[PDB]
């Protein structure tokens, strides 16, 4: 079974730094396209970070562009995200999604469980 | 089969007069003993329709334009006219109505056809044991993107076409408004009254198709019969009239059929009949409309200024302003 | 065609971003009936839902998908960002950027001819003043909401032209003749007296109309017979009285009705009650 | 002329009922069974005027 | 705002908005209001505040 | 900051909603001394979801 267990959440100050993890098993890791998803309190879903199959392209939402850092693990197959220069409005449940990558027109984002992150002071 | 005709001959486009033919039921409402005035694409009365006849070695099947919609007629005894390739540049980019009425069923195929250049069906072997059988099925071979196909119920198979006198006749109307083939149709084998189409007969709708293509040309599909190596064009004829946005006045009878009609803009007497809304005009002097001289062409006269306006300096300025003091730029 | 449409379950679902109906109201869809219903599925950019209305212009409404100005339908659009977007942009969705003129409404265009920008004939290649008209969509889920893919269905229906093929869920009742009823014949509401008619309809027709163009005779869609709608409620009421200073006795003249309500005597002006 | 003039004045009045007057349809009940009352007020107000 | 605003007119007057009763006459301080607040042109805000 | 017509949030979805034609004023002040209890004023019961 595909398993996406998330860890590395909590509380942080405005301007601080964080790092997320996503324990990914049950699939070939470069066959599925990996992305980071947040869900604010009172809002819906939101994409903040996007990386391709071989990890050769790192893409960022405009509200988090130039501040976050997406990466990957090509030996233990675990998804990471270095969040830096944090802002108070980033209070959200940060999930972990994985595309099915089936024939380039279908998109099945295998949503994980998410770790609760609050940005308050 | 990319083999053209062996005995094709260039003949001039002979004309006839469409007397009152080509009037269709404009909508699906029942009227009774009224004179209803409508305005749509109509076949104007007393106009030239092209007399395309197929005779013994002397026939052309040209590419006819499709300005606003076309009339069609068919003076057959032998079922030789089948279908209509439609389209703009006559490729696989268009869809085409075909009625391959092979004396068994009303087999209609409305697809994107594999395109043909000189297409023909044909019956053969008629000296003995004919049975009206066909083999040369070259008007259709394959068809990708078949968006439609319909099979209507069979009709009275009138194989008996009596030689000489003019009885068996059909009348179709092919127009296209907002992707819709409002194909109007009427199957009238006329009784022999006096030798010619003269009288009145109204048309009625059969189908409507959600096609949505641009059409500026069409053709007409063919067959062959004789009692095409040793074969020629079979003895029949078809008529082409174009439709124009006219205005008619239409006398529905007691039972509800259009018995008599009045074109408005034919002659001033019928314009008077359209203004009074009656087919009988008593003695007097009547005012019809205004005399309206045509406009020739459009004349645009702007002053010869060529330098642009400072839209870069305003739309993409560097030092901005605020709502406390806005910069009224003068242009 | 040939089905019953539960428009309510298509409507009260909150999944749809834009549910804007044009010829009708979206609440009487469940009772009003139609003749031909067409669904037009296509995927567009985010803010381009503005350019799907009767009369809009732009780049979707002008070159590759136009609605006529007499449009009678509903437009459904919902965000499909979680099902269309890809990590490198979904290149499987395209649009015509370049067109020679405007496009006629409800007209598909599958032409691949190279749009000659300047004067040089391109001879079947792209390049300098040879612009390929069919661009692509970069559908990344990290995009802004104005570039996110919305799936749009234009649900046009052909209304008041023909016998009906698609009608919503209302149960029919039994037919009542020769009585002043409040009828609903396949979409039209009226109030009259239904008698069996002698009018003969051609089978592509349903509705007989009089000189004021009101529905005079119908075809029952359940059993295909022809009825005859005669109105109720003839005439007016006139009160015959002596002076109030003489009596309070009155008479009542119902003008030009038969004695239907019901001394009671049939004057040639109508039924006269109380004289 | 008296009989004809009264009859034509009645037939004109009857044939004014098949007129849109800006509204969607001349049929009052079709407007009454397509639109909400907030817009049926507009269309019926054109017909009443 | 001090009075009725007529259209196409800039209110560039450097008279200080006195709301209460203390006469200010051109300085700030005790109830001497100043409606000319500043724009935060930082990229940190939400898209409804840009 | 979520007592607004048309907006979303915890105040604007589960327990309160404003209309778009709202007139009037939204009045509050510093009331830390007026409702707070030492262990927490859990006597002010509320429905969260
Ligand atoms: C039909 O054609 C002839 C010759 O082309 C022409 O003289 C005649 O006026 C035409 N008829 C009409 C009604 O235009
Ligand atoms: C109407 O139909 C009846 C039916 O028998 C027929 O007798 C009559 O001649 C028809 N009248 C007209 C004007 O068509
Ligand atoms: C002004 O700026 C816009 C976008 O910033 C650009 O698309 C446009 O071409 C510019 N106008 C010029 C350069 O005249
Ligand atoms: C409905 O049922 C009746 C008999 O119960 C039948 O005559 C009629 O044809 C049916 N309707 C349709 C559309 O077939
Ligand atoms: C209606 O009036 C007619 C005469 O106008 C009369 O013969 C008939 O009996 C009346 N109807 C009834 C139901 O009494």
UniProtKB/Swiss-Prot annotation, chain E:
Instruction: Extract the ranges annotated as region (Receptor-binding motif).
Output: 1-50
Q: List the disulfide bonds.
A: 24-32
Q: What is the effect of changing residue 30 to P?
A: In strain: Omicron/XBB.1.5, Omicron/EG.5.1
- Domain of life the protein comes from: Viruses
Q: Where is this region: Disordered?
A: 1-34
User: Changing residue 21 to N does what?
Assistant: In strain: 20A.EU2, Iota/B.1.526, Omicron/BA.1, Omicron/BA.2, Omicron/BA.2.12.1, Omicron/BA.2.75, Omicron/BA.4, Omicron/BA.5, Omicron/BQ.1.1, Omicron/XBB.1.5, Omicron/EG.5.1
> How the protein is affected by changing residue 37 to Y?
Reduced host ACE2-binding affinity in vitro
Q: What is the effect of changing residue 37 to R?
A: In strain: Omicron/BA.1, Omicron/BA.2, Omicron/BA.2.12.1
Effect recorded for residue 28 to K: In strain: Beta/B.1.351, Eta/B.1.525, Theta/P.3, Iota/B.1.526, B.1.1.318, Gamma/P.1, Zeta/P.2 and Mu/B.1.621; May enhance affinity to human ACE2 receptor
Q: Quaternary form?
A: Binds to host ACE2. RBD also interacts with the N-linked glycan on 'Asn-90' of ACE2. Cleavage of S generates a polybasic C-terminal sequence on S1 that binds to host Neuropilin-1 (NRP1) and Neuropilin-2 (NRP2) receptors. Interacts with host integrin alpha-5/beta-1 (ITGA5:ITGB1) and with ACE2 in complex with integrin alpha-5/beta-1 (ITGA5:ITGB1). May interact via cytoplasmic c-terminus with M protein. May interact (via N-terminus) with host bilirubin and biliverdin, thereby preventing antibody binding to the SARS-CoV-2 spike NTD via an allosteric mechanism.
- Please explain the role this protein plays, according to its UniProt record: Attaches the virion to the cell membrane by interacting with host receptor, initiating the infection. The major receptor is host ACE2. When S2/S2' has been cleaved, binding to the receptor triggers direct fusion at the cell membrane. When S2/S2' has not been cleaved, binding to the receptor results in internalization of the virus by endocytosis using host TFRC and GRM2 and leading to fusion of the virion membrane with the host endosomal membrane. Alternatively, may use NRP1/NRP2 and integrin as entry receptors.
Name the chain's protein: Spike protein S1
What species was this sequence derived from?
Answer: Severe acute respiratory syndrome coronavirus 2 (2019-nCoV)
- First-to-last residue of the parent protein present: 457 to 506 of 1273
From Swiss-Prot, chain F:
The effect annotated for residue 49 to L is: In strain: Omicron/EG.5.1
Task: Give the start-end ranges of region Immunodominant HLA epitope recognized by the CD8+.
Answer: 41-49
Annotated consequence of substituting residue 45 to R: Increased resistance to neutralizing antibodies. Decreases HLA binding to NF9 epitope. Increased binding affinity to human ACE2
Q: Report the outcome of residue 45 to R.
A: In strain: Delta/B.1.617.2, Epsilon/B.1.427/B.1.429, Kappa/B.1.617.1, Lambda/C.37, 19B/501Y, Omicron/BA.4, Omicron/BA.5, Omicron/BQ.1.1; Contributes to cellular immunity evasion and increases infectivity
Q: What does this protein do?
A: Attaches the virion to the cell membrane by interacting with host receptor, initiating the infection. The major receptor is host ACE2. When S2/S2' has been cleaved, binding to the receptor triggers direct fusion at the cell membrane. When S2/S2' has not been cleaved, binding to the receptor results in internalization of the virus by endocytosis using host TFRC and GRM2 and leading to fusion of the virion membrane with the host endosomal membrane. Alternatively, may use NRP1/NRP2 and integrin as entry receptors.
Q: How does it assemble?
A: Binds to host ACE2. RBD also interacts with the N-linked glycan on 'Asn-90' of ACE2. Cleavage of S generates a polybasic C-terminal sequence on S1 that binds to host Neuropilin-1 (NRP1) and Neuropilin-2 (NRP2) receptors. Interacts with host integrin alpha-5/beta-1 (ITGA5:ITGB1) and with ACE2 in complex with integrin alpha-5/beta-1 (ITGA5:ITGB1). May interact via cytoplasmic c-terminus with M protein. May interact (via N-terminus) with host bilirubin and biliverdin, thereby preventing antibody binding to the SARS-CoV-2 spike NTD via an allosteric mechanism.
Protein name (database record): Spike protein S1
Q: Which organism is it from?
A: Severe acute respiratory syndrome coronavirus 2
Supply the source organism's classification: Viruses, Riboviria, Orthornavirae, Pisuviricota, Pisoniviricetes
Q: Name the encoding gene, please.
A: S
The shown residues of the full protein are: 408 to 456 of 1273
